[PDB]
Design a binder for these strands. Sequence first.
DNA 1: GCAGACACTACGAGTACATA
DNA 2: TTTATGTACTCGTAGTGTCTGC
Lengths: 330, 331, 341, 320, 257, 256
Amino acid sequence: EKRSKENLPWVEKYRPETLDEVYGQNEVITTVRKFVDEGKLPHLLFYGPPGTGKTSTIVALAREIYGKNYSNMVLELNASDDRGIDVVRNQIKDFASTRQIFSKGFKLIILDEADAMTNAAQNALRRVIERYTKNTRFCVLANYAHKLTPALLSRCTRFRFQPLPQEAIERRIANVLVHEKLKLSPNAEKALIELSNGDMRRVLNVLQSCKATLDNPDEDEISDDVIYECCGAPRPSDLKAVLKSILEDDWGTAHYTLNKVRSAKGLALIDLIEGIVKILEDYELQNEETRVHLLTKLADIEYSISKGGNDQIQGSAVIGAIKASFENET
Amino acid sequence: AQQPWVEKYRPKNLDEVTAQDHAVTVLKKTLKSANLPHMLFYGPPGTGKTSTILALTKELYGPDLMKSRILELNASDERGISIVREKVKNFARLTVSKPSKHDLENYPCPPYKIIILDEADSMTADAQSALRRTMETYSGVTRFCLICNYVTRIIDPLASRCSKFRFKALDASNAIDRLRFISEQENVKCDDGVLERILDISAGDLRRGITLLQSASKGAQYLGDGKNITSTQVEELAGVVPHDILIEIVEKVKSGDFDEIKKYVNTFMKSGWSAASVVNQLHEYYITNDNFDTNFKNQISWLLFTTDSRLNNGTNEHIQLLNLLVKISQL
Amino acid sequence: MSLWVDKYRPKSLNALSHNEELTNFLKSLSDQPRDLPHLLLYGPNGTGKKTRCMALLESIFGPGVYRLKIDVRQFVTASNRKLELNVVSSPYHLEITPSDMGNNDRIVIQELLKEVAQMHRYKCVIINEANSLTKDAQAALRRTMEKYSKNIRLIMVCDSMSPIIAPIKSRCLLIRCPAPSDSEISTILSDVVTNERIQLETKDILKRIAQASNGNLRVSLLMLESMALNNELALKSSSPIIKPDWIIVIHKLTRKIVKERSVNSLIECRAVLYDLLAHCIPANIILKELTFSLLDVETLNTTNKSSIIEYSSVFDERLSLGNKAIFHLEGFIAKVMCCLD
Amino acid sequence: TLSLQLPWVEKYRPQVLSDIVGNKETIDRLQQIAKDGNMPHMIISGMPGIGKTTSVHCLAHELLGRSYADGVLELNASDDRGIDVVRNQIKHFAQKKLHLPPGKHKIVILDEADSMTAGAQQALRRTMELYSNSTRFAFACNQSNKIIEPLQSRCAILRYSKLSDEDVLKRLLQIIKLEDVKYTNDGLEAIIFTAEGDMRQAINNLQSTVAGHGLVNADNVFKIVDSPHPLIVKKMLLASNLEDSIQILRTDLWKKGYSSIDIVTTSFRVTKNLAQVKESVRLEMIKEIGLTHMRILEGVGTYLQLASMLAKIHKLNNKA
Amino acid sequence: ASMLEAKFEEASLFKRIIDGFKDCVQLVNFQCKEDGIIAQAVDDSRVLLVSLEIGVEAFQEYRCDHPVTLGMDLTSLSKILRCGNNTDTLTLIADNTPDSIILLFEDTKKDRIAEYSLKLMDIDADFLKIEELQYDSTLSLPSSEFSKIVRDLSQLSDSINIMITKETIKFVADGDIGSGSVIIKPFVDMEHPETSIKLEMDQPVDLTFGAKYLLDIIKGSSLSDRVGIRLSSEAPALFQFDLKSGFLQFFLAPKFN
Amino acid sequence: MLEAKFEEASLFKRIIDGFKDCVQLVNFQCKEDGIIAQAVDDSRVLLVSLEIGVEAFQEYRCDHPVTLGMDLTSLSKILRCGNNTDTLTLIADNTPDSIILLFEDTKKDRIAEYSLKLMDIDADFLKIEELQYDSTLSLPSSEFSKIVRDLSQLSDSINIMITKETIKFVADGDIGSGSVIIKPFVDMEHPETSIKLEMDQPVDLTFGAKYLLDIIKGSSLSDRVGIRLSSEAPALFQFDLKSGFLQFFLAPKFND
DNA sequence: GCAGACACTACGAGTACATA
DNA sequence: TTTATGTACTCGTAGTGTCTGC
Ligand SMILES: Nc1ncnc2c1ncn2[C@@H]1O[C@H](COP(=O)(O)OP(=O)(O)OP(O)(O)=S)[C@@H](O)[C@H]1O
Ligand SMILES: Nc1ncnc2c1ncn2[C@@H]1O[C@H](COP(=O)(O)OP(=O)(O)OP(O)(O)=S)[C@@H](O)[C@H]1O
Ligand SMILES: Nc1ncnc2c1ncn2[C@@H]1O[C@H](COP(=O)(O)OP(=O)(O)OP(O)(O)=S)[C@@H](O)[C@H]1O
Ligand SMILES: Nc1ncnc2c1ncn2[C@@H]1O[C@H](COP(=O)(O)OP(=O)(O)O)[C@@H](O)[C@H]1O
Ligand SMILES: [Mg+2]
Ligand SMILES: [Mg+2]
Ligand SMILES: [Mg+2]
């Protein structure tokens, strides 16, 4: 790096350095702290969605076990480096077989993003794990468990990282605002919670971009308007207005309202579709067929949007799908 | 000059990037600071992602350090997991180039370099998985700017690491100032609604509007009469179907008679029109009318959506157009 | 040359009597050749797009565009799967085709264009069959033409530009080439028959030739030459209009489908389709001609025709999304037979 | 840095053939081979965690404890196995002259042999054919279909089945008395249910419960480890109302941090292994689930795709 | 003018230094200060740690007014060091906050000049101050004898065990084709002070090392005629090749029991 | 009709060591005045020529011109039996189906007779146009081979630029850059290592590394190698010999 | 000291597999 | 057999170094 901190993104500037700074996964942190305090650390497997604090947790755990110089005491392998079966046969075998060069403790092997590892490498890793388990522990971080062999899943204790709740995001946001002397309105906080979707990294990126959005970073408070303008997300009022126009008015009014809402602030159609879907899941639909029609048609529309095409045709298709599905109600 | 108006009028600064204000102000404020994050530029084609990143690089470093502190990769060179591993890691794990006294005195050179990965949607997911921890580890010395137009082709972890900046489609209200400025600079005489019609024809694409303006200007000079360009000329250049032919399409469809529709579609397709424009014009005719009830529009919106999604995947325009017109005819 | 279709091909913009507005547009583009952007000519097949491209090159560069030769360039893909491709080069321009392997058309677009982009001041590259690219050569070509533009320019010739991706259509000036009417085809054929020596009684046979070609200069010219050769250079009023052997086989297949709708009929159709695909005939054109031959049968009502065109669209999508061409054609024929019976 | 205690998986690994539980007939056959000593070439197969390699090691130890170091060659996937590094080493070991008791032979244990190269197996064929008088082979693989036909011809096939709840329960109680830890019957049945026949998984979960809470009860067990997602997916696919399946999906998979691709693959596996419903219904469900799988793989991984897949499942189930 | 100017009497010395440990490790930081050029590098398997040190005496003329870290690839440095002769001289030139260093080659002839620049690289490895605690067995033997013993015993097994008991050095390698044992007594030669085996006895040891790491260590045995091996039951082994002004220390981690 | 006898066996093998990788096989054209053999590589980039005079032969007889299309691997396999005292002898007849190689030794009565079949090429595209070169420099063969292989260890291309009294070789790869400068100098003590450069116009040319390796593989032919350069023109790599010279025709890499 | 004579590592070409 | 990347394996060859010998 260069120029120390303050030149880093807030994703990397606020990486936890202690296991007490990892919010959300209270059960996982307490269990691993009990594991390291009692002197029994099994072969861990951290599973969960991105941004939930897996590599941060394992880095803080290794730092707690060893100290500041954990980087030289731990063999960390990731999909960035080559991880063929030659690597498993030489580097992992030598690191597991040999004694510690800097201390008198056990060896820790961190297989970061190990879901991108070949089948034969995992097959060798099974025997490597079983053979040298007396003085070497393996930690496997993965986002998808279907890419791991069943025997590797059997050999490793599974810890699931649940998406970050309300309290954890609020606490981290409060810490960041305290550090940066930044202000933020509570409704903006709820908007950021909604935009998080269990991802702390999205929260940090949006906070950085919104601090850059304000004309003066001091003595101006972040509002929900700033969050929605910087992120480009549709406001709940806009989604409610679009849905009301579609569900209550004729085609001309609905089309005009959707076009006006999209062109007022440059709203994306996929964001509107996601918001409309989230609103419609709370509806008390009378028929079992309205849900089927809505879900299938909107999935087809969002797939076509992902493949790209004409936005006007897709918007009219959204309006028509919603109206036709709700025509089955009565 | 010696270059097309698209390349001639590329935004040299960040002040010249119109429409998109949120991302431009974020980058402008980050210019003074050094908190540039890993960015993910996305949006429709022609919205100005490459121009924005080029300008941001231009006044981050200057004309001198730009070559040394930038690695730009495209689909023009192979980007398998081997190259995306070794070349990207080798560039990132280097130290940043040393600026001169002149560069420090004039430009605010940051202590990091930028690895611009344009057209990142075409990369293999294995290459992106390799890119993940390289992006995370060397953040203090290098920055990554993924430029794509299809977000779903980028895996979830990279979307998590990379700050996302959506580029708005350039509507006729956002991009009217840029085309007005270009017309004033190039001495293009046009009517009141000609620029608005040009922006309406394009679907959030200022580049296509600039090309249409260039073609209209070229025709105007070739005629040599010095007359103002009308909307009909830029409509003929854009390839949109005239309204009388669309009226004939509607009249043929309304009366049924499969054979008549088939023959007229054969003639219309040998006329050489692009089926996507025909479907768009049929949509904007049928949906915006007041002579059709709610059920007809509900069905025709899905019919046009299916036809457009089919036309996007190659296919034969004749068969798709005939099927769409026949399905509309039986509504 | 020996064939009349290549004997009277125009060599200049002023030598074209095919589309007045299109020729005026090309003259406007050639009036200021320095700022000429990347073009993309699209339209129905056989109308004279490449004739327009060569005439525009002659108007921009000069005579010598048609003094062109062929050189072979060696390209190596992954492993040692050696591929031989020959470029039809010339002074003042280059010509390339996706005629290489469809999954290996990216390497030519990468290496050849990076080589010719090394250094009036630019060279023009013509890409025929541009609709046959496989979404990766186009992806490379996006930045290949956006970055290198002051020294290389593109004239991208294609028909039915839907497979062309959105960014390529964004950075290409689209030019539309319509097919002529019956009068223009008849005029060109009359010019041919008066430049050569053909005995003709009533020009209605030329009108019939224009009708048969369906707005196709190449097909009409070859049909005229073939009918003159068969009639010993003396065209008759009731001269039988020729059809390609493929068209006759497709019509026989359509008659078989209409007449008998059993499963032995299906295996006979499979054999016919296997022969047709084995004899260098594209699958999408096969499906289009089969569809429009089925819709020309008068014994079907409107419901069968609508179902036929719907299944034709669905299996055209499938053909565009698949590689085993016989599978989708067999499925389409089975579905049509199930619908009709 | 503090040292770590031995895990319960390896601390309580059986050392004799009587401590291993499960397939009583196979273990009795192994003990009779133990008594006789004329051990034939054997292939041991089954799903992971049911006592495959520990039985081989116990058999070798009891057969020749004094010469385990000398006349046992334990090659495996961690070791480099190829054509030459296998043929040379195994030929040298098989031709090696070592003096055993009259009923004993050298044992070449090819643990994890399903990943071996075919040419290596071809050389192994003649190795076993020539040197069967001195050395004997003992394969152990998860999937026995990878081993070529002639090797399975020149071997004694020993198939291992997943343990019933009774055997895993017996081993769990034995280890509990050995470790002297408090427990509740509900927690033990929860551990057995979570293990699904895998003894190693049961031991790992029991040790995690003991070291994280201290009391093996249902609440602690379900706190540390969740119910398996195949079961929740199976009850999501078999639910009656579409709303029930939608809410099960959302709450128990989406809010639990389960990837959409994992949910789709699990649904495919369950529908393939599902049994109560008719075959054609399963085929239609697999077809539409695979369409959704293609959509997920192309990049469109959202909640809406899973909801649409469930809606299509219900539109198929209610018979239009 | 340039900040760092480290001249070499002969260009062959630094090539020999690099080739001694160019294969075991490929990332290295050269810590240039007034005292000398020192470098610590850790193997990719985190088994073999190399602690290079070149004093100010080994340089013809040396000046480093400010400390600077030099992140280098040993593969690239080795392949760029081949561009020289034995008579040629070397001068490591660096500026402040450098992008690269200039491998400026010279000669007796002023016509022969060759300039090479290899870009520096960013390494965040925190640098460990080794205490070098008391070793149970401290022994010195000629490098040729140690290299021969290691090469002969590497063909037998993958692990070489070194037992130092009752003032007797013993190397054993139990393998598949057979087992071998080389026993050398600590004799002293008054005839030659370089072939004498020296051994200091405090406590007996029993340490097993890998064969490939021992081969990598003995590949750097051309730098000194004698290698001083110090062993300990709780510390990594030390293989010090003393240079004219500094030393080349190899720290090897023994296998677990 | 051809009776060629070398003074010593270790001459023609030493010549063809350079020929090994520059071109797979050549079409010999043996005349009474001398022996020549020219061929073109696969990519038509590097061309090589050979010229051996009669003075290098103890007894050279050539009644009629003889065309020999022969490979090099089998020929070198034959020549591997060349003792330090054994003498080469090339024997051919009318319409040679196979060249006759015979060996004679003085200290021993043993005789070695070998024959090699003659292949076909059917491509004798020959043309010589350029004779005048703007720049001309002479370097030792060992020094030139060392410098070019050292630069090839750093980059896949080598840049050779000439200025007044500064023979400069520039190499720039991906790991870094390398600049080498050697100046002309004449010394009486060691004329073999003397370096001279006479120049008319500056020359800037970039060449490929593999072709330079092919050129330098014949480093044992001459103690000093005279490479002369031309601006915006292909350069010639000439190797001296007692009774002739060998030259390498290499085109530039699109100089501009 | 120099030329082989050797065994060694490294590079290149080719084949085969890819869900249980 | 086609299939289009990436991995792993196997083999063969070319350099690359070191040990014997005169
Ligand atoms: N529980 C948490 N408490 C505090 N910060 C968190 C937490 N989880 C994530 N973060 C933040 O998220 C940033 C990046 O997440 P990481 O934990 O480093 O990566 P990850 O969570 O393992 O996601 P993947 O699977 O690697 S893409 C960290 O630098 C933290 O700032
Ligand atoms: N926001 C903008 N302001 C001004 N000109 C713009 C803007 N966006 C696009 N342009 C024009 O569009 C051309 C450059 O387009 P690009 O910046 O390459 O678009 P893009 O983001 O690269 O879209 P792609 O690369 O095809 S996905 C120039 O003619 C610019 O003048
Ligand atoms: N039948 C059994 N009786 C007792 N312990 C068992 C039994 N099966 C498995 N275990 C325990 O499971 C752990 C390891 O079992 P292994 O036999 O090594 O698994 P495995 O049968 O080899 O399956 P794979 O395919 O190798 S992963 C040890 O702690 C054993 O004690
Ligand atoms: N103005 C014209 N006069 C005479 N013939 C023409 C004219 N325009 C086109 N043609 C005919 O068209 C043929 C070429 O068409 P072609 O380039 O194959 O069309 P496409 O490129 O659309 O397939 C030529 O043989 C030529 O005879
Ligand atoms: Mg992580
Ligand atoms: Mg771009
Ligand atoms: Mg096992």
